Design a protein around this motif. Sequence first.
Motif, mmCIF file in Angstrom:
data_model
loop_
_atom_site.group_PDB
_atom_site.id
_atom_site.type_symbol
_atom_site.label_atom_id
_atom_site.label_comp_id
_atom_site.label_asym_id
_atom_site.label_seq_id
_atom_site.Cartn_x
_atom_site.Cartn_y
_atom_site.Cartn_z
ATOM 1 N N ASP A 231 0.867 -1.207 0.000
ATOM 2 C CA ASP A 231 0.000 0.000 0.000
ATOM 3 C C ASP A 231 0.889 1.237 0.000
ATOM 4 N N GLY A 232 0.292 2.388 -0.290
ATOM 5 C CA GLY A 232 0.970 3.695 -0.293
ATOM 6 C C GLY A 232 1.059 4.273 -1.691
ATOM 7 N N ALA A 233 2.168 4.933 -2.001
ATOM 8 C CA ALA A 233 2.381 5.651 -3.276
ATOM 9 C C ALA A 233 3.402 4.915 -4.139
ATOM 10 N N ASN A 234 4.193 4.021 -3.548
ATOM 11 C CA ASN A 234 5.311 3.335 -4.235
ATOM 12 C C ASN A 234 4.938 1.875 -4.490
ATOM 13 N N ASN A 235 3.685 1.598 -4.834
ATOM 14 C CA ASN A 235 3.230 0.209 -5.088
ATOM 15 C C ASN A 235 2.734 0.091 -6.531
ATOM 16 N N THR A 236 3.269 0.894 -7.445
ATOM 17 C CA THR A 236 2.737 0.994 -8.827
ATOM 18 C C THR A 236 3.485 0.062 -9.782
ATOM 19 N N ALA A 237 4.534 -0.631 -9.329
ATOM 20 C CA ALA A 237 5.299 -1.579 -10.176
ATOM 21 C C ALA A 237 4.414 -2.772 -10.541
ATOM 22 N N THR A 238 4.421 -3.158 -11.816
ATOM 23 C CA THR A 238 3.581 -4.270 -12.334
ATOM 24 C C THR A 238 4.401 -5.541 -12.545
ATOM 25 N N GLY A 239 5.727 -5.440 -12.622
ATOM 26 C CA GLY A 239 6.594 -6.611 -12.832
ATOM 27 C C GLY A 239 6.528 -7.070 -14.281
ATOM 28 N N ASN A 240 6.545 -8.383 -14.505
ATOM 29 C CA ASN A 240 6.559 -8.988 -15.861
ATOM 30 C C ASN A 240 5.289 -8.599 -16.630
ATOM 31 N N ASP A 241 4.122 -8.729 -16.008
ATOM 32 C CA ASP A 241 2.815 -8.471 -16.669
ATOM 33 C C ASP A 241 2.395 -7.035 -16.327
ATOM 34 N N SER A 242 1.148 -6.650 -16.592
ATOM 35 C CA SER A 242 0.621 -5.282 -16.334
ATOM 36 C C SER A 242 -0.186 -5.230 -15.028
ATOM 37 N N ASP A 243 -0.037 -6.218 -14.144
ATOM 38 C CA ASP A 243 -0.778 -6.261 -12.855
ATOM 39 C C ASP A 243 0.159 -5.909 -11.705
ATOM 40 N N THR A 244 -0.258 -4.946 -10.894
ATOM 41 C CA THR A 244 0.488 -4.508 -9.692
ATOM 42 C C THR A 244 0.388 -5.590 -8.625
ATOM 43 N N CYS A 245 1.381 -5.617 -7.755
ATOM 44 C CA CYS A 245 1.563 -6.702 -6.764
ATOM 45 C C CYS A 245 0.363 -6.772 -5.812
ATOM 46 N N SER A 246 -0.264 -5.635 -5.511
ATOM 47 C CA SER A 246 -1.403 -5.548 -4.566
ATOM 48 C C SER A 246 -2.618 -6.279 -5.143
ATOM 49 N N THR A 247 -2.999 -6.007 -6.388
ATOM 50 C CA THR A 247 -4.136 -6.704 -7.048
ATOM 51 C C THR A 247 -3.719 -8.134 -7.376
ATOM 52 N N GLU A 248 -2.424 -8.349 -7.596
ATOM 53 C CA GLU A 248 -1.875 -9.692 -7.895
ATOM 54 C C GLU A 248 -2.166 -10.622 -6.707
ATOM 55 N N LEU A 249 -1.990 -10.139 -5.471
ATOM 56 C CA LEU A 249 -2.295 -10.914 -4.231
ATOM 57 C C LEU A 249 -3.799 -11.128 -4.098
ATOM 58 N N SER A 250 -4.600 -10.103 -4.393
ATOM 59 C CA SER A 250 -6.071 -10.123 -4.188
ATOM 60 C C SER A 250 -6.710 -11.218 -5.051
ATOM 61 N N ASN A 251 -6.208 -11.423 -6.270
ATOM 62 C CA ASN A 251 -6.746 -12.455 -7.190
ATOM 63 C C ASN A 251 -6.506 -13.852 -6.612
ATOM 64 N N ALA A 252 -5.528 -14.011 -5.723
ATOM 65 C CA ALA A 252 -5.210 -15.312 -5.091
ATOM 66 C C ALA A 252 -6.021 -15.511 -3.802
ATOM 67 N N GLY A 253 -6.906 -14.576 -3.457
ATOM 68 C CA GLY A 253 -7.801 -14.692 -2.292
ATOM 69 C C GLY A 253 -7.079 -14.415 -0.988
ATOM 70 N N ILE A 254 -5.863 -13.884 -1.051
ATOM 71 C CA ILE A 254 -5.049 -13.650 0.166
ATOM 72 C C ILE A 254 -5.481 -12.338 0.810
ATOM 73 N N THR A 255 -5.853 -12.416 2.080
ATOM 74 C CA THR A 255 -6.168 -11.240 2.921
ATOM 75 C C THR A 255 -5.023 -10.966 3.896
ATOM 76 N N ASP A 256 -4.153 -11.947 4.157
ATOM 77 C CA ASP A 256 -2.979 -11.772 5.050
ATOM 78 C C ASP A 256 -1.849 -11.186 4.216
ATOM 79 N N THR A 257 -2.014 -9.936 3.840
ATOM 80 C CA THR A 257 -1.093 -9.264 2.910
ATOM 81 C C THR A 257 0.177 -8.888 3.678
ATOM 82 N N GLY A 258 0.119 -8.650 4.981
ATOM 83 C CA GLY A 258 1.313 -8.351 5.791
ATOM 84 C C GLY A 258 1.017 -8.571 7.258
ATOM 85 N N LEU A 259 1.929 -8.210 8.164
ATOM 86 C CA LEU A 259 1.771 -8.496 9.612
ATOM 87 C C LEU A 259 0.648 -7.625 10.155
#
Lengths: 144, 289
Positions: free
Chosen positions: B183-211
Amino acid sequence: RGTSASLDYNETPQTILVGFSFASIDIQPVTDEWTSGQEIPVVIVDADQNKNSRADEDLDLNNPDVTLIPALRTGDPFTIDEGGTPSLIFTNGTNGDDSIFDTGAINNTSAGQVGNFTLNINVTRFSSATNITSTESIDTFSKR
Amino acid sequence: SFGFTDDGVQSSERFANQIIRIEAEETGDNTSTFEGSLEYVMVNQINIQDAGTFSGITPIADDPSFIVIEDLTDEDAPRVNYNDLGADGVTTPVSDQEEAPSHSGVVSLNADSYKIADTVVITVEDLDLNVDSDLIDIFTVVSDNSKATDDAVGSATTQSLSFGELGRLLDVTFDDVIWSTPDGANNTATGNDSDTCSTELSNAGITDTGLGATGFTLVETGAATGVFVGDFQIPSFWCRVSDTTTTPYTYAGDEETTTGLDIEVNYVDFRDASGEIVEVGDSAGVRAN
């Protein structure tokens, strides 16, 4: 979970801790085999459903504030979530003279059961002048 | 007056100026015995930053409390003085002292190996973290993208000092990297594909995104036990922190499995057995079959 409050009488404070409890469910067969036409008990132990220490509580489907209900399933029922999360709207109005709700009847005839569904809506004095729309959610196992 | 100057690492740099009066009560009617109590709160990296802890003490009472900024032993041990008129008619004080040591904390992890979706339980045995004998003591995780103490157990209020960050008490890492939500302002990297890491986790049903998103808290077992326990569940995927030197952190563009990575917990003792800052930790391995 883990957060607390503090209540004090006689200069001795006490914490009110919030926590969750692991549940345990177990079917208990009366003798070696469960045969046809015999009632055996099913027992659930979950402190999270005991929301009143001075009252005995029932897991009623109809109460939205009971969050979990045990369920048993066989084969492929057609539950209300069979096509994914539904969409529901409520409305005020009156049935048309050609509506199945006003002309039909349950008499095992196409004349009675089969029709079409027509209605006239008056939600103009409703809040924001729209039909009541809802947010939907589905229980994993109870299908509510 | 209460506080420290500079780093607060050297003893000459820590100060606490206070006077405490005991209004003791007669035990019986004709018993010349007068009864009172003392209690003290040892300062940690979290409460030292809050004016609440210093204003919380009761300076004049039958049961006063006072602040200890560091280990107090030998000549510096707290002492109560009572001026007295003796049977020989001369005024001769009587006094008693008791040392107020500090304790070295340990942190442990209940198992040496975990598997996906296993409960992991963290315990911290530091007696100095008990600040009240009547109430259970609780420490909570920070969720503020504008502070260096993000997704760690501590305080949003913080400062940058020599030993590290002053608002940080405990945190959890995968492969020696902070386990934080994208989360924040520096989470805009998409990596190999055009999906950001935050939405990338959400598609896997993960709610335990961090501590901070597991609801992890450190809870004292008893009112004055001095043992704190927290727990959470290991996720299938996590989002790595690319750069920790920026606030907010910069997150990678692709989720990674937690399998085959070590898990670690780090505890920072503001006061060890000598009253100095040290960090201690434990490790374990995440496995798959």
